[PDB]
C-alpha cells in the first residue's frame, strides 16, 4: 500500500499493541508473559514467551 513511512511505523506500533493486548487477554490461563514480532523480509514471525508451553501449543 501507499502509506507514509512515519505512519507505517505508527501503524506497526498500534499492531504490536493490539497483539500484546490480545495475547494478554487470552493466554493468562496458560501464563502469558510476552510477545515479540519480527517483520522478516519474507514472513512476519511472532514469538510467544509463555509459561505453560504445553497448553499454549495445544
Amino acid at each position: 500500500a501507499i502509506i507514509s513511512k512515519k505512519r507505517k511505523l505508527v501503524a506497526d506500533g498500534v499492531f504490536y499493541a493490539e497483539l500484546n493486548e490480545f495475547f494478554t487477554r487470552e493466554l493468562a490461563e496458560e501464563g502469558y508473559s510476552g510477545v515479540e514480532v519480527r517483520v522478516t523480509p519474507t514472513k512476519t514471525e511472532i514469538i510467544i514467551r509463555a509459561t505453560k508451553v504445553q497448553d499454549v501449543v495445544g
Partner: protein, 106 residues
C-alpha cells in the same frame, strides 16, 4: 542475464539507532565483500514525532502537560550494482525491527 547495472536503492527506517547502524554497516561491508561502488550511508534528519496530552485523565488540578515522542531515521543508500548480488545481500541479515525497502530505480 541481468549483469547490467540497475542503479538500485535501499531505504531504511527504524525507531531505534543501534540496529539501524548495524544494518547499514553490514550492507556496506557486504557490498565491499562483493566489491561494488556506492554512495555512502548518507544520514537523514531525525524525524522526531512529538504529541502532547493532558497528563490528568479527567481534567482537574494544576494544568499538567506531558510529551510523548519517537525519533526515526532513514539513511538511504544507493548502489551501482547488478541484480542478483544486491538481492542476495538485502535478503540476508535483517535483524528484527528495522524496516528495509528496496527499489530498482529503473
Amino acid at each position: 542475464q541481468e549483469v547490467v547495472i540497475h542503479k538500485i536503492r535501499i531505504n531504511l527506517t527504524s525507531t531505534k539507532v543501534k540496529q539501524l547502524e548495524n544494518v547499514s554497516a553490514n550492507i556496506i561491508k557486504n557490498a565491499e565483500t562483493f566489491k561494488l561502488v556506492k554512495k555512502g550511508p548518507v544520514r537523514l534528519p531525525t524525524k522526531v514525532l512529538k504529541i502532547s496530552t493532558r497528563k490528568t485523565p479527567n481534567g482537574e488540578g494544576s494544568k499538567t502537560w506531558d510529551t510523548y515522542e519517537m525519533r526515526i531515521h532513514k539513511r538511504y543508500i544507493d548502489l551501482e550494482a547488478p541484480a542478483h548480488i544486491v538481492k542476495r545481500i538485502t535478503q540476508i541479515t535483517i535483524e528484527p525491527g528495522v524496516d528495509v525497502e528496496v527499489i530498482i530505480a529503473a
